[PDB]
Motif scaffolding. Structure first.
Motif, short mmCIF file in Angstrom:
data_model
loop_
_atom_site.label_atom_id
_atom_site.label_comp_id
_atom_site.label_asym_id
_atom_site.label_seq_id
_atom_site.Cartn_x
_atom_site.Cartn_y
_atom_site.Cartn_z
N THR A 120 0.85 -1.19 0.00
CA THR A 120 0.00 0.00 0.00
C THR A 120 0.90 1.27 0.00
O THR A 120 0.40 2.39 0.05
N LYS A 121 2.23 1.09 -0.08
CA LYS A 121 3.16 2.19 -0.49
C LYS A 121 3.74 2.04 -1.96
O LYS A 121 4.19 3.03 -2.61
N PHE A 122 3.72 0.82 -2.51
CA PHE A 122 3.94 0.67 -3.98
C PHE A 122 2.63 0.33 -4.68
O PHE A 122 2.61 -0.45 -5.59
N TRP A 123 1.54 0.96 -4.23
CA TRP A 123 0.18 0.62 -4.69
C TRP A 123 -0.22 1.53 -5.85
O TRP A 123 -0.19 2.76 -5.70
#
Lengths: 113, 116
Positions: free
Chosen positions: B47-50
């Motif tokens: 949900t940070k490389f999303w």
């Protein structure tokens, strides 16, 4: 400290392969072995079935595209191939996907000094 | 029968939302709410490389076509919505059960047909 940073660099750049399924079209997938290291990403069958081999310096991005449940996540890898961006999509269980996305980004981020 | 079909024509421009899968790059789906009325069509991801999914809002007068793309089973059908966005035709693909899909496709085409 220096030991921990070196160990994390070794660990992110060592070759590791992962059994994932590559998504050709909606619900048409094949099982593959996706091998990633600091030097190359390779995709081999366990629609084109010739192995794919990508120099890691041609990689551009790797992102989580959809996490459905703990057991179903999809990620997208982008790379350069004869001057165009191509995208490969794979799915697997969510822990595997998250490990792969972090390993590829750790290798993209290590290029800077 | 006839009178339920006339009720559906009468209510065709009223707002109604449907829970359907949006197909991305002809490869995977995410879940959206598709809100349709005679004013506009909205798609809101449910949900940070999303890869972020931005909400889409389309004025109904920029809609061009809504077509059943294929019907697999009673359980999976796919339809295609075409619209004009900054001077180009864009195309979105959605799938759901066949009943839901046939209802949306009819509703959108009642909206396109009422231009006059």
């Amino acid at each position: 400290g220096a030991m921990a940073t070196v160990q994390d660099m070794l660990s992110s750049h060592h070759y590791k392969s992962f059994k994932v399924s590559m998504i050709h079209r909606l619900r048409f997938t094949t099982d593959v072995q996706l091998g990633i290291s600091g030097d190359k990403v390779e995709i081999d069958p366990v629609i084109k079935q010739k192995p794919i081999s990508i120099d890691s310096d041609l990689l551009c991005a790797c992102d989580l595209a959809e996490e459905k449940s703990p057991s179903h996540a999809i990620f997208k890898l982008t790379y350069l191939s004869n001057h165009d961006y191509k995208h490969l999509y794979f799915e697997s269980d969510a822990a595997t996907v998250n490990e792969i996305v972090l390993k590829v980004n750790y290798i993209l981020e290590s290029r800077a000094s």
